[PDB]
A paper describes a structure:
No genes encoding for a canonical PAPS reductase (route 1b) or sulfo-transferase (route 1c) were found in the M. thermolithotrophicus genome. However, genes annotated as dissimilatory APS reductase (α and β subunit, APSR) are present and co-occur with the previously described genes. To gain further molecular insights into the unconventional APS-reductase-like enzyme from M. thermolithotrophicus, the enzyme was crystallized under anaerobic conditions. The structure was solved by a single-wavelength anomalous dispersion experiment measured at the Fe K-edge and refined to 1.45 Å resolution. The complex organizes as an α2β2 heterotetramer, with the same assembly as dissimilatory APS reductases. It is, however, drastically different from characterized single-domain assimilatory APS/PAPS reductases, which are thioredoxin/glutathione-dependent. The residues coordinating APS, invariable in the dissimilatory family, differ in M. thermolithotrophicus and might provoke a switch of specificity from APS to PAPS. Despite a short soak with PAP, the putative substrate pocket contains only solvent, and we used the AfAPSR to artificially model PAPS in the active site of the enzyme. The different substitutions mainly carried by loop 104–123 would accommodate the additional 3′-phosphate group by salt-bridge interactions and hydrogen bonds. In APS reductases, however, a conserved glutamine (α145 in A. fulgidus) would clash with this phosphate group. Taking together the enzyme rates and the structural analysis, we propose that M. thermolithotrophicus harbours a unique class of PAPS reductase (MtPAPSR) used to convert PAPS into SO32− and PAP.
Residue numbers in the entry:
A (entry chain C): 2 to 102
B (entry chain B): 1 to 110, 119 to 248, 254 to 557
C (entry chain A): 1 to 556
D (entry chain D): 2 to 103
């Protein structure tokens, strides 16, 4: 599922126009909010849309999540992924849009 | 509430893989056609492709023919398929892959199938091509029923979840491309992770339910596709080496054919017989191989990365555990959905269908869904040539649908929420209609209980109360799935044989039966409020 | 926070069936003894008896003897019980039933004044107020009670137990309770595995969902030995509401049937409790379910008697019948299995004790569902063990005085451990989240409902490592009030119990108890395993260590 | 599980001293509240304790509950159970404390 880090969120609204479940909306104060974190499919569309990495994906503790998180920053030609393990160690993985696997 | 009447030539319900290609193909055929897509979410990412794709699975290498594809499809499921649908899909698989490249999908070399892709943005590129073609799109708009006039579909009703609007959309022809149905059974992890599943949790059978309510015929709901995927995160396995049980034995070697159904069946046996869990044996791959895997999964199923980080799993040292999903009602990887003719016309005049919502042809994949959208829209374009949207819809019929759509919003007496009824339904189906908890096995006595329990859920729908238009969407997802579930139970009750292992496990009739080499179809009778089963004979494809 | 130091002679942890009778019996022996019960909830209704009970299920009806009781209890384990414990319970069952009558329990009597038998070893009662009656008798004996007070650890001086630590959930108070002897009567453990209906109905289960293994965990942390955690009792009960079946089966004499109407127990040589459950699982797996108790054809008066009986001990079933339009005279009653529980009443898991119910720690005694070795105990057997334990504890305290002095650093250490998540500003998980995580691990890898109770070595090895990772994350829990602090300690305790369960299941390489201990990779019973598998917790290594204890013939 | 009918509750607190799970407490305004309805065992101790029948037991919809409810009135020598089905039909059953079954 995902969490919105409201202190980082700049209220741009971009994450509210991507979700296949319509789960994200902009509150009156401008911040984004998820309707119900239990309904998230973990498609990461919102994570990649946020320009300030205020959205992070994490695995529900109820199914074994231990606090690792995934954030994503879109560049002109790539997605830079920031993976933070459960002890805070960060790994940065850049995947060029034209890179094929 | 503002009621808006819209007019279009071609109305497409659902802007996913099949609906986008249908709309693009329509504009390519006739630039002057008015084409409107009604999409529940946001077309840039909506549907099964939201997370990206691992590969383009279905196209033909040099020397392969549609006949080769038909035989593969029969080997991957059974001999009882709609050969005419499979063959006509096969003729266009390669053309559909070429269009994806034209639209901007990154592709590189290393036969033809040996390509490297980045599927991360497959849906955005498809959506961008759709809008560039001049297609009009109503996003965040939920279709709720077809507009019927004299047994002919001439449009659809829909409501917005971002504005206080109800749409009466008149059209010369309608194409259903809503995908299949998930969320009928309990998922692998109910509650906190209830939408961590293989199929889209936002494809909730709307197309099936609108079809059934309008009188259209469905087929083969007893064939419930179950996905074998990485445990808990439900990530693809194609990316990731052989299958092993917990003893390290390559248990597939015990079976003659290594087909998708066989891999699931074999894995269930290993677990049931005390040799699980089962895994993909990634042990021994290189450090660079691990990095490649991480980059690929980030582009189509990122949750697995978090599982590996949390559980200290390095695939070169620890194999990847796999298991089966809930059963889904789909016509992409399975063969459940609308009954259509070779031109993808449903049993209702004016209504066509394409993609995971159409039954009879399993192993469709993205290219196959795109191809079906083209076939359907080509047929619809020929059908609308003569006519015009001059149909007059009585205000009373409009008011009737409005009352039905918004009923729980005005229900001060309601006592249940959509979420409560959804869970109740999923429990019934899991326990009495062959869910995970029964290892997918069904028997007559439990199915008869499921039939009666679903009717009692249906009775309680009128006791649902919602507070906003988003919760109203959830109500309609539940209304739709209850009807689909009632059809599934009737299909499962009727086929007294086991034709598809795992996907249709009739434990009380465990053998395949030559007397059952026919299609089991259903129709919803709105007068008696009952599902009616129709038998359709199998026909060899012989075009002349 | 108020740190309250209390001195007592006999400290009883848990004011349930065994704890109440232990306390009453103490005051019978010596009215001047200071006896104190620490009770997590409200003694008037606390523990497994909260809803009432369907009958007294351990009573020696005419012709029955303690020796024949033992012979019957032995059968399920193929003789692997602590016969000394069972026999000494058997000698007191009828006394305990008479005590319940003296306290005010209505027990049906015939014209001669004999209790009315319901089965071979059960008698008919109105059990709705069994716990209030026991609690009233306890308070009338002069026993002191701290309600809404959660025990967290024993006080140990060297290797001797001399009290316990507890915290209130209604006052900002922490208790240091010094005692000459302690009796652990906390019951067993539920909530280690996933229940039948996780989420909305997660506490609809057979065993009390509020008995979460505190006694097992306190004993393990203090160095005491546990026994036979691999024998996990599973209840065959009415589906979803988890209601008793004895009232329908024993009271009406109805048979178990599959959905075809066949009496499937006739296919099995022995119609025992574990086989009734095993046979039901087979019927369902092989496509002949659901299974039911066949009430079809009973009279309208019998239906009324059933409704009144179930209202008095499991009222939820009445609501299911009304919602689903079930009249038992027309529709049979669907049955199914529960989660596995770690219990010493209906099962034989718990503390390892001597015949006097002394644990392996000096100063610590135990009684009831927390004590292993002797299944088929029931409410009278638990009461009997309470008496045996307290009698021995009183003899032991005769010499000593409450002159033991605890060191302030030790008190401070427990306070820091007990209140840690309340002060954890940086915490990121809730007790509920971790509880669900643990239940998933156990359900999937240690033989829960989802695997039809089956376990294998490979899955158990995974469970061992996953539980260790959960324990590492306990330090990341935060709680916001004392009620949620109690829930944190329930999780902490259950994790330790689960780790022990896994080790026991790993160690016993045979299948001795069908359903309750299904090692599918060792599917046969093995005479070389006719011995007890015990465990202790090593605090230096943070690991559970297995100890084998030989079976000893009991000769009185 | 159970629900507190706040319009009926008189804020007496009696229901807060029986629950084996410590689930019921008195809020600032005196009325009873359940900490988490998912943690209820359906033992009915609170239902019986409430002198004005402001506590009713019902089965969770998520497991098939359809709205039937149970309330209970303690008398000097009995419990009077009030059973209302999902359509509002009411059945009242008194079980005398000294009455034994079968
Ligand atoms: C997780 C996953 C991974 C996959 N990976 C691959 C792969 O690597 N390669 C491959 O070839 N295939 C893959 N597939 C298969 C492929 O994605 C599907 O077969 C295909 O996307 C289905 O196309 P569709 O048009 O029928 O449905 P979809 O693409 O899902 O589109 C359905 C549309 O209908 C909309 N909708 C639903 N209800 C309503 C309503 N009431 N009103 C309006 N709109 C509505 C949805 O929002 C959606 O936009 C994958 C599928 C899944 C689920
Ligand atoms: C649903 C059910 C129905 C039954 N029906 C019958 C029947 O009809 N006939 C029959 O003979 N037997 C019956 N039994 C068995 C009998 O009820 C139990 O064997 C017996 O009550 C167990 O007694 P106990 O003292 O060990 O545990 P309990 O009576 O459950 O008491 C344990 C006490 O410990 C307290 N406690 C727990 N943790 C802590 C902590 N950290 N600090 C302080 N206190 C704590 C609890 O709150 C509770 O008061 C039934 C049991 C159950 C579960
Ligand atoms: S990860 Fe996907 S499903 Fe979840 S909130 Fe973001 S866009 Fe929606
Ligand atoms: S995209 Fe990011 S910064 Fe913009 S509203 Fe969403 S969370 Fe906030
Ligand atoms: S029914 Fe029992 S468990 Fe539920 S809140 Fe009332 S007293 Fe507590
Ligand atoms: S016992 Fe009844 S009236 Fe009294 S506080 Fe509780 S719910 Fe309210
Ligand atoms: Ca859902
Ligand atoms: Ca719990
Ligand atoms: Na962390
Ligand atoms: Na290396
Ligand atoms: Na830690």
């Amino acid at each position: 599922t995902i969490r919105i880090i409201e202190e980082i969120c700049i209220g741009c609204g971009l994450c509210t126009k991507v979700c296949p479940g319509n789960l994200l909306y902009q509150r009156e104060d401008g911040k984004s909010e998820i309707m119900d974190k239990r309904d998230c499919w973990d498609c990461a569309a919102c994570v990649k849309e946020c320009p300030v990495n205020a959205i992070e994906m994490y695995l529900q503790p109820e199914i074994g999540g231990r606090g690792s998180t995934l954030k994503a920053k879109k560049t002109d030609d790539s997605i830079v992924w920031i993976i933070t393990d459960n002890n805070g160690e960060e790994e940065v993985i850049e995947v060029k849009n034209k890179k094929t696997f | 509430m503002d009621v808006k009447k819209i007019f279009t030539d071609i109305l497409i319900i659902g802007g996913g893989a099949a609906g986008c290609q249908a709309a693009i193909r329509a504009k390519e055929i006739d630039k002057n056609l008015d084409v409107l897509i009604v999409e529940k979410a946001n077309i840039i990412r909506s549907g099964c492709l939201a997370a990206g794709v691992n590969a383009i699975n279905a196209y033909l290498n040099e020397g392969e023919t549609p006949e080769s594809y038909v035989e593969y499809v029969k080997k991957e499921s059974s001999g009882l398929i709609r050969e005419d649908l499979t063959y006509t899909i096969g003729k266009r698989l390669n053309k559909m892959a070429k269009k994806l490249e034209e639209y901007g999908l990154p592709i590189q070399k290393d036969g033809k199938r040996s390509i490297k892709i980045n599927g991360e943005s497959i849906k955005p590129i498809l959506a961008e091509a759709t809008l560039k073609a001049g297609v009009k799109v109503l996003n965040n708009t939920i279709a709720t029923n077809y507009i019927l006039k004299d047994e002919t579909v001439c449009g659809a009703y829909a409501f917005s979840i971002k504005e206080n609007k109800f749409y009466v959309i008149m059209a010369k022809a309608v194409i259903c491309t809503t995908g299949g149905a998930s969320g009928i059974y309990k998922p692998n992890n109910p509650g906190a992770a209830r939408h961590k599943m293989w199929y889209s949790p936002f494809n909730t059978g709307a197309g099936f339910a609108m079809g059934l309510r309008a009188g259209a015929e469905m087929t083969t709901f007893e064939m419930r596709f179950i996905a074998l995927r990485v445990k808990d995160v439900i990530s693809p396995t194609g990316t990731i080496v052989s299958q092993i049980n917990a003893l390290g034995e390559k248990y597939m070697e015990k079976y003659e054919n290594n087909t998708t159904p066989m891999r699931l069946y074999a894995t269930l046996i290993e677990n049931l017989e005390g040799r699980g869990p089962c895994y993909l044996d990634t042990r021994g791959i290189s450090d660079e191989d691990v990095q490649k895997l991480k980059e690929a999964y980030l582009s189509m199923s990122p949750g697995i990365i978090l599982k590996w980080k949390d559980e200290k799993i390095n695939p070169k040292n620890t194999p990847i555990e796999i298991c089966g999903s809930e059963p889904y009602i789909v016509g992409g990887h399975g063969q459940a959905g609308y009954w259509v003719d070779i031109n993808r016309k449903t049993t209702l005049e004016g209504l066509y269908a394409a993609g995971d919502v159409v039954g009879g042809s399993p192993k469709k994949y993205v290219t196959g869904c795109m191809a079906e959208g083209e076939i359907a829209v080509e047929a619809a374009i020929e059908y609308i040539k003569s006519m015009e949207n001059d149909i007059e819809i009585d205000e009373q019929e409009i008011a009737k649908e409005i009352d039905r759509v918004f009923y729980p919003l005005n229900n001060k007496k309601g006592e249940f929420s959509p979420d409560e009824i959804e869970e109740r339904m999923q429990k019934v189906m899991d326990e009495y209609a062959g869910g995970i908890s029964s290892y997918y096995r069904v028997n007559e006595s439990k199915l008869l209980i499921a039939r009666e329990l679903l009717k009692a859920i249906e009775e309680d729908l009128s006791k649902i109360k919602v507070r906003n238009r988003y919760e109203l969407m959830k109500y309609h997802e539940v209304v739709d799935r209850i009807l689909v579930a009632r059809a599934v139970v009737e299909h499962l009750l009727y086929r007294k044989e086991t034709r598809w292992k795992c996907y249709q496990e009739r434990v009380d009739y465990p053998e395949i039966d030559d007397n059952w080499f026919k299609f089991i179809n259903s129709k919803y009778n709105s007068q008696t409020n009952d599902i009616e089963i129709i038998e359709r004979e199998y026909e060899k494809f012989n075009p002349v």
